[PDB]
Write an enzyme that holds these catalytic residues in place. Structure first.
Site, PDB file in Angstrom:
ATOM      1  N   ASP A 173       0.818  -1.193   0.000  1.00  0.00           N
ATOM      2  CA  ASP A 173       0.000   0.000   0.000  1.00  0.00           C
ATOM      3  C   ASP A 173       0.875   1.275   0.000  1.00  0.00           C
ATOM      4  OD1 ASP A 173      -2.342   1.346  -0.239  1.00  0.00           O
ATOM      5  OD2 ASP A 173      -2.801   1.330   1.917  1.00  0.00           O
ATOM      6  N   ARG A 202      -0.095   9.181   0.476  1.00  0.00           N
ATOM      7  CA  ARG A 202      -0.926   9.245   1.672  1.00  0.00           C
ATOM      8  C   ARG A 202      -0.325   8.357   2.773  1.00  0.00           C
ATOM      9  NH1 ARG A 202      -3.856   5.706  -2.102  1.00  0.00           N
ATOM     10  NH2 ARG A 202      -3.564   3.692  -1.086  1.00  0.00           N
ATOM     11  N   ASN A 203       0.517   7.354   2.441  1.00  0.00           N
ATOM     12  CA  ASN A 203       1.089   6.433   3.431  1.00  0.00           C
ATOM     13  C   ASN A 203       2.552   6.710   3.764  1.00  0.00           C
ATOM     14  OD1 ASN A 203      -1.392   5.275   3.855  1.00  0.00           O
ATOM     15  ND2 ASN A 203      -1.082   3.734   2.270  1.00  0.00           N
ATOM     16  N   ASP A 251       1.602   2.801   7.705  1.00  0.00           N
ATOM     17  CA  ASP A 251       0.379   2.162   7.258  1.00  0.00           C
ATOM     18  C   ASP A 251       0.700   0.767   6.732  1.00  0.00           C
ATOM     19  OD1 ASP A 251      -1.077   4.312   8.332  1.00  0.00           O
ATOM     20  OD2 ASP A 251      -1.580   5.174   6.404  1.00  0.00           O
TER      21      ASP A 251
HETATM   22  C1  LIG Z   1      -2.905  11.796   3.844  1.00  0.00           C
HETATM   23  C2  LIG Z   1      -3.955  11.802   4.944  1.00  0.00           C
HETATM   24  C3  LIG Z   1      -3.448  11.139   6.213  1.00  0.00           C
HETATM   25  O1  LIG Z   1      -2.609  10.236   6.116  1.00  0.00           O
HETATM   26  N1  LIG Z   1      -3.876  11.486   7.443  1.00  0.00           N
HETATM   27  C4  LIG Z   1      -5.078  12.237   7.833  1.00  0.00           C
HETATM   28  C5  LIG Z   1      -4.799  12.703   9.234  1.00  0.00           C
HETATM   29  C6  LIG Z   1      -3.792  11.710   9.813  1.00  0.00           C
HETATM   30  O2  LIG Z   1      -2.783  12.502  10.483  1.00  0.00           O
HETATM   31  C7  LIG Z   1      -1.684  11.997  11.136  1.00  0.00           C
HETATM   32  C8  LIG Z   1      -1.459  10.666  11.337  1.00  0.00           C
HETATM   33  C9  LIG Z   1      -0.275  10.235  11.992  1.00  0.00           C
HETATM   34  C10 LIG Z   1       0.057   8.865  12.260  1.00  0.00           C
HETATM   35  N2  LIG Z   1      -0.736   7.846  11.790  1.00  0.00           N
HETATM   36  C11 LIG Z   1      -0.677   6.494  12.188  1.00  0.00           C
HETATM   37  C12 LIG Z   1      -0.700   5.454  11.259  1.00  0.00           C
HETATM   38  C13 LIG Z   1      -0.566   4.137  11.672  1.00  0.00           C
HETATM   39  C14 LIG Z   1      -0.484   3.871  13.008  1.00  0.00           C
HETATM   40  F1  LIG Z   1      -0.389   2.590  13.439  1.00  0.00           F
HETATM   41  C15 LIG Z   1      -0.492   4.871  13.945  1.00  0.00           C
HETATM   42 CL1  LIG Z   1      -0.397   4.480  15.625  1.00  0.00          CL
HETATM   43  C16 LIG Z   1      -0.553   6.196  13.541  1.00  0.00           C
HETATM   44  N3  LIG Z   1       1.198   8.556  12.857  1.00  0.00           N
HETATM   45  C17 LIG Z   1       1.992   9.569  13.252  1.00  0.00           C
HETATM   46  N4  LIG Z   1       1.796  10.862  13.147  1.00  0.00           N
HETATM   47  C18 LIG Z   1       0.632  11.203  12.490  1.00  0.00           C
HETATM   48  C19 LIG Z   1       0.357  12.569  12.291  1.00  0.00           C
HETATM   49  C20 LIG Z   1      -0.746  12.954  11.583  1.00  0.00           C
HETATM   50  O3  LIG Z   1      -1.099  14.242  11.335  1.00  0.00           O
HETATM   51  C21 LIG Z   1      -0.416  15.289  12.045  1.00  0.00           C
HETATM   52  C22 LIG Z   1      -3.107  11.065   8.624  1.00  0.00           C
END
Ligand SMILES: *CCC(=O)N1CC[C@H](Oc2cc3c(Nc4ccc(F)c(Cl)c4)ncnc3cc2OC)C1
Length: 324
Positions: free
Chosen positions: A142, A146-147, A160
């Site tokens: 994947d 986005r990932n 992801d």
């Molecule tokens: C392209 C859209 C997108 O990926 N997102 C919408 C909002 C979200 O924002 C954040 C996500 C994270 C994550 N995500 C994550 C993925 C897998 C997983 F097992 C965990 Cl515990 C967490 N991880 C770290 N920092 C993030 C920061 C984000 O936005 C500030 C993603």
């Protein structure tokens, strides 16, 4: 028979997480940001926290623990690792907060300040991450912009892992069965025969690079997913982005060659993008490129733009928080 997976799975008490606030939702569930404060450590670690709507769906807790397994088992500067899990009403995954979010949105929102040096460096880093995953016999399945997450504008990491699959001591192709798929990122052989290899991941890398070089365009926009296999079989491919020299676009095209083994290896992609990063304006042509800048760790309201000043004393990035 195959090497033992001695990754540690850390079970983290809910009382150690504070300042929890929503980053985003889906059907699947929610991601929050917070601080993780391991008890009597005088450290506050910025974290993201992923859960699902409810711990009833059996599949749900099973799917998320599958993701936890893969994420605990990786350790590389260009891949996101699990810090631990929290067992509540729901299973929550805990990881290093990547404060600038996902690279797709990042490129869309900051296009006017994204120059050639950053684009090529990201290509290099994503290739390193992917190469590391290959060395660990993992197929991501994947990879997409986005990932990929942005720790700082200078430093991105793949995440992801919910579709990632290992590969046996002597096995080559994962051969999947059903479930919503990222068709527009998939190699033909994956769409046709649910075959998945390190070489199918290279296809997706190609697409991901196209996303970056178009500042976040949607691939095959308006084309229904059902038609993608046909288009690809006719020999159609994503078009040359405006900023790309032939040198860059050719690499993308090589990733999309029918013969999986004719595609570049991640190790080769690192080399090629790295050569290009030394003279970036020779390889990507961006109007007013030389005059761009993005935030860097060494700026004033870099730490204050994230953090409450209350916390700032003892904040420690997960990349500097190591246990034996
Ligand atoms: C392209 C859209 C997108 O990926 N997102 C919408 C909002 C979200 O924002 C954040 C996500 C994270 C994550 N995500 C994550 C993925 C897998 C997983 F097992 C965990 Cl515990 C967490 N991880 C770290 N920092 C993030 C920061 C984000 O936005 C500030 C993603």
């Amino acid at each position: 028979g195959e090497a033992p997976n001695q990754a540690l799975l850390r079970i983290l008490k809910e009382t150690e997480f504070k300042k929890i606030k929503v980053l985003g939702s889906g059907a699947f569930g929610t991601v929050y940001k917070g601080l993780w404060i391991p008890e009597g450590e005088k450290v506050k670690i910025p974290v993201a926290i992923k859960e699902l709507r409810e711990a009833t769906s059996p599949k749900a807790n099973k799917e998320i623990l599958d993701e936890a397994y893969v994420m605990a088992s990786v350790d590389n500067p260009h891949v996101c690792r699990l810090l631990g899990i929290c067992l509540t009403s729901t299973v929550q995954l805990i990881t290093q907060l990547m404060p600038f979010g996902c690279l797709l949105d990042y490129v869309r929102e900051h296009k006017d300040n994204i120059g050639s040096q950053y684009l090529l460096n990201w290509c290099v880093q994503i290739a390193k991450g992917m190469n590391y995953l290959e060395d660990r016999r993992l197929v991501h399945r994947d990879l997409a912009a986005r990932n990929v997450l942005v720790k700082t504008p200078q430093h991105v990491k793949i995440t992801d892992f919910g579709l990632a699959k290992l590969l046996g001591a002597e096995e080559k192709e994962y051969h999947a069965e059903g479930g919503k798929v990222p068709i527009k990122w998939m190699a033909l052989e994956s769409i046709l025969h649910r075959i998945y290899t390190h070489q199918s991941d290279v296809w997706s890398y190609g697409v991901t690079v196209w996303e970056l070089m178009t500042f976040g365009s949607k691939p095959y926009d308006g084309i229904p997913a059902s038609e993608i296999s046909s288009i690809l079989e006719k020999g159609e491919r994503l078009p040359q982005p405006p900023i790309c020299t032939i040198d860059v676009y050719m690499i993308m095209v090589k990733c999309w060659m029918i013969d999986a083994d004719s595609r570049p290896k991640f190790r080769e992609l690192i080399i090629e993008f790295s050569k290009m990063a030394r003279d970036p304006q020779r390889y990507l042509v961006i109007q007013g490129d030389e005059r761009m800048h993005l935030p860097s760790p060494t700026d004033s309201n870099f730490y204050r733009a994230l953090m409450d000043e209350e916390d700032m004393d003892d904040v420690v990035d997960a990349d500097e928080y190591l246990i034996p």
